[PDB]
Design a protein around this ligand. Sequence first.
Ligand code: HEM
Ligand SMILES: COc1ccc(C(N)=O)cc1
Ligand SMILES: COc1ccc(C(N)=O)cc1
Ligand SMILES: COc1ccc(C(N)=O)cc1
Ligand SMILES: [Cl-]
Length: 393
Amino acid sequence: TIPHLAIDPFSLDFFDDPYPDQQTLRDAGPVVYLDKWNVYGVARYAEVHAVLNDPTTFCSSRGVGLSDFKKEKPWRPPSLILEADPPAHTRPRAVLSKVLSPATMKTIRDGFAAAADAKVDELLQRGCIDAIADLAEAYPLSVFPDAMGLKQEGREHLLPYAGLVFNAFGPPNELRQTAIERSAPHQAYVNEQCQRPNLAPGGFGACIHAFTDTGEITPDEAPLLVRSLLSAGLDTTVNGIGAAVYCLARFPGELQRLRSDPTLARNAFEEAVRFESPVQTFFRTTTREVELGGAVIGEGEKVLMFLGSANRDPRRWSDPDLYDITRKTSGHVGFGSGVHMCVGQLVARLEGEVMLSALARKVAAIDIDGPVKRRFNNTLRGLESLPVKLTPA
Ligand code: HEM
Ligand SMILES: COc1ccc(C(N)=O)cc1
Ligand SMILES: COc1ccc(C(N)=O)cc1
Ligand SMILES: COc1ccc(C(N)=O)cc1
Ligand SMILES: [Cl-]
């Protein structure tokens, strides 16, 4: 039998303090039912991990938002990659995997690192900064659109476009309906930038389009794949980096360990992703009767996965509520898991690593001094403002 809960995981109150409610989602049972949205959810590591890794039973092509694409109209033309199942998922996934490969990362690494080092130097001259606007936002804006091959004009649409995209996975609450209603200028900007002539040579965009020349993808598929990176590639990392800086500020001891060993940079970042989980929730839809958490769920049912909760499940993590930069982070579901596991994870880890490496080397202390402000999103967790004083090494 399946416990009914009145928790609204897409409400402002939940966003503002999700942890007691997430403990309840986990502790009530391995499978729950949410009265407010009439859907099943699993919040424990074991179930979330199991669902991610059985795409046959828990498919994505019926949407990874609440909306069931088999019965409803998608808010936009579906992603070729995020919202598709094997075998169809395979080819577009292969393309983005090549474009965002370890080898590609070697070619851009030095530029990313110098940008990060320069960015921290610049902030140190001011002292009083906003770790969101001046760092978590500024840094990825300075490297990712260039690495994409994007024109300078119209970049201000990138953040709110991703905000839109992630709200749209949500239920039809105010956050979602207001996003979609204000969407047209963002979409129109994005659609211009997805076209072959507008993407600089040597960038992610052009590289994607090159796959049309070999017959690997069509001229129609090409722009939709660029759309994927512009949908998913920025706001996530912004929140990842913001999360890392927030953790180092709240856990001063962990910052000092990072200064003592800056090679901990990449793992400090991974641990921030586990701890805050910029992407909080995704859905799947059952393709058959299936037993999950000891309950039988019927075919065609949406299932809500609490990734951020799974990453804090005491059944899997010791002292889950502590930021520990030497934790074995392997296994966390912040980037998902299985066939859909984040295809841009190397890009994100590169941005986060080089940026925490710069902080590790150049900063002695990070102190919160001012009102902290949260940004609300149906899917993304992160801060709108984080005033900090940086003290130079
Ligand atoms: C901290 C940063 C990031 C986080 C937390 C994150 C999170 C995730 C998660 C949880 C998934 C799984 C989706 C699912 O299972 O349905 C995913 C997939 C994906 N991510 Fe990321 N991501 C990040 C950075 C990036 C970057 C930098 C890019 C592109 C440059 C990117 C592009 C994608 C794409 C295209 C997919 C779809 C993969 C597929 O369906 O095969 N993400 N991401
Ligand atoms: C699958 O193709 C489409 C195309 C457009 C839309 C839309 N604009 O909502 C939804 C689905
Ligand atoms: C246009 O296609 C896509 C693909 C992936 C994503 C994402 N992970 O948010 C968003 C949009
Ligand atoms: C997470 O979603 C968003 C939305 C808008 C902005 C912004 N306007 O800077 C930043 C992030
Ligand atoms: Cl769009």
